[PDB]
Amino acid sequence: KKISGGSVVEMQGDEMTRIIWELIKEKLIFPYVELDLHSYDLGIENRDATNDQVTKDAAEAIKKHNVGVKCATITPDEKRVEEFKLKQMWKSPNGTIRNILGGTVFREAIICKNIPRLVSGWVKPIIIGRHAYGDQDRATDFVVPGPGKVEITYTPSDGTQKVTYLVHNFEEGGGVAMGMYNQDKSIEDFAHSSFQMALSKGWPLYLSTKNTILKKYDGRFKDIFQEIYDKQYKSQFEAQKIWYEHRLIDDMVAQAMKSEGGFIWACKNYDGDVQSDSVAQGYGSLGMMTSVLVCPDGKTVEAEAAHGTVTRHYRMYQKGQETSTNPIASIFAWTRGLAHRAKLDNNKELAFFANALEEVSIETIEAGFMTKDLAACIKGLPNVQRSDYLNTFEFMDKLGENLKIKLAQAKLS
C-alpha cells in the first residue's frame, strides 16, 4: 500500500461491473496503492435513497479533486422501477456528470495481438471524440396526449421579443415531442479538443454531421469547426501532413467501415455514444475500450468504462453460475485515472504503476489467458469450450499474479 496516490473520486456502480469494481480495488489497486479516496456510491439503491443527490455530489467532487473513475450504472426505465421499487425513473448518472463537467469523451479500442477483429481492414486505431454536452442527454421529451399544438419558443434575457416556432399541430391522435439544445462555447471546446488530439497523435480529423437535414443545428457545428480550423489550426495541420474534413454521417460511417483506421473521429453526443459501441465491437470486444472524459480546463478528467452493467451475466452470478465478464475496460478506467493523477502531482511512482498494470493486462491476454468473449474472437462462439478461457475471478487472480511479478521485478533495477 506504499505508493501515495493522492486524491481520487471513486464512483461505485451496479450489477456485474460493481462486483468487478470491488475485485479491482481489492486485488489490483489497494495492495500497492494508498489513495485519499472520496467514494460516492452510485448504485441504484443509494441513488434512490438520496433522490439522485449523490450523483451531483460526485460530480462536484470531481471538479474539486480533478480526477474520477466511474463504474457502470443502471439508468432505470419502467421495468427497473418495478424491479428495485424505485421512487422515480432517475436520469442517467453519466449524463448528469457529463453535463456538469462538460468537455469531450475520447474512446479508443484496447488492442491485443492475438485477438482477431470483426472488421477486416482496421490495422490502426480509430479514436472517437464524443461531444459530451447537450443534445439527447439533456433533451426535454413528453407524450402528446391528443390533438393540439406543439411549439418551441425563444425569449432573450431582456426579453424584448419572443420567437415562436411551430413544431407540429396534431390534428387527430397523439404522439411524442421533444426539445433539445447545445451551446456555442461547448461546441468550441469540443472543436479545440478534437483538433489538439489530431496533432497529438499526428492524424487527420473527420467530423460527421447531418447538416443537410438540420441546417441551423448541425450547421453550427460545421461552421464552428471550420472557422477555428481556418484561423487557428490550419498552418499546424499542414506542417504535419494531415488535414481536417467534414463528412455527412452517412458517408462517414461507410468510410470508417472500409478504412484502415488511423484517424480521429469527432462525433456529436448521440453518434459517439452509438458508434463507439460499433467500433469497440468491431475490434472484437466492448470489454476492450477506454473512455476518458477530458474537460475544457485541460485539468479535470473522468475515466470510466463505456459499456453497461452486463445484466445477463449478473443474472447468472445470482444463480451461482460461473461468469466470464471482461474487466479490462473497468481496469483501464483506474489506470487512465491514476495516470492523470500522477501527471497533476508529478508522481513518477504512480505514473509507473498505472502504465505497468495496462501492460500486465495486455501481456496476460496476448499470453493466452482471457475471458470467454476474447476466446470467442479466436475460436468463434460455437467452438469455444470451458477450458478455453478463465472465469471472471480466475482472470482477476491471474492479473494479480502477473501484476505482483511485474512490480517485484521492477523493484530490482
Ligand X SMILES: O=C(O)CCC(=O)C(=O)O
* Residue number with CB closer to a second copy (249 or 384): 249
Q: How near is the Cβ of 90 to ligand X at its closest, in Å? A: 10
SS3 140: strand
User: Up-side HSE of residue 347: CA atoms within 13 Å toward CB?
Assistant: 21
Q: Binding-site residue total for ligand X (CB under 6 A)? A: 8
Q: Are 274 and 173 in contact (CB under 8 A)?
A: no
In the window 90-149, what residues touch a second copy (CB under 8 A)? Answer: 92, 95, 116-121, 134, 136-149
Q: Which of 5, 134, 284, 287 binds ligand NAP (CB under 6 A)?
A: 287
Binding region for Ca ion (CB under 5 A) out of 21-29, 213-221, 271-279, 380-388: 271-279
* Residue number with CB closer to ligand X (221 or 369): 221
* Residue number with CB closer to ligand X (255 or 355): 255
336 has binding-site annotation: no
Q: φ, ψ for residue 319 (rounded to 5)?
A: -90, 5
Q: How near is the Cβ of 138 to a second copy at its closest, in Å? A: 7
CA–CA separation, 339 and 352 (whole Å): 8
Q: Name the one residue in this structure whose C-alpha cell is 453526443.
A: 269
Q: φ, ψ for residue 315 (rounded to 5)?
A: -65, -35
Give the pairing type, strands 289-294 and 301-304.
antiparallel
Q: Where are the alpha helices (DSSP H) in 10-77?
A: 15-23, 44-49, 53-65
* Residue number with CB closer to ligand X (271 or 369): 271
273 counts as binding ligand X under rule CB under 6 A = yes
Binding region for ligand NAP (CB under 6 A) out of 68-76, 97-105, 125-133, 203-211: 68-76
Binding region for ligand NAP (CB under 6 A) out of 51-59, 125-133, 170-178, 299-307: 299-307
236 counts as binding ligand X under rule CB under 6 A = no
Q: Name the one residue in this structure whose C-alpha cell is 451461482.
A: 320
Query: Which three three-digit cell numbers place residue 221?
Result: 457545428
277 counts as binding Ca ion under rule CB under 5 A = yes
278 counts as binding ligand X under rule CB under 6 A = no
Element (H, E) at 69: strand 67-70
373 counts as binding ligand NAP under rule CB under 6 A = yes
Encoded one letter per residue, x for contact with ligand X by CB under 6 A and - for no contact, window 75-114 reads x----------------x-xx-------------------
User: Up-side HSE of residue 76: CA atoms within 13 Å toward CB?
Assistant: 21
Residues in the chain: 413
Smallest CA-to-CA distance from 63 within 22, 98, 23, 110 is with 98
Q: Are 58 and 98 in contact (CB under 8 A)?
A: no
Q: Name the one residue in this structure whose C-alpha cell is 479500442.
A: 109
In the window 234-253, what residues touch Ca ion (CB under 5 A)? Answer: 250
72 counts as binding ligand NAP under rule CB under 6 A = yes
In the window 310-349, what residues touch ligand NAP (CB under 6 A)? Answer: 310-312, 325-326, 329
* Residue number with CB closer to ligand X (22 or 250): 250
CA–CA separation, 58 and 41 (whole Å): 9
SS3 142: strand
Q: How near is the Cβ of 287 to Ca ion at its closest, in Å? A: 13
Phi-psi map region of 229: left, alpha, beta (phi>0 left; psi -120 to 50 alpha): alpha
Q: Which of 27, 138, 192, 307 binds ligand NAP (CB under 6 A)?
A: 307
Binding residues for NADP(+): 73-75, 80, 258, 308-313, 326
Binding residues: 73-75, 80, 92-98, 107, 130, 210, 250, 258, 273, 277, 308-313, 326
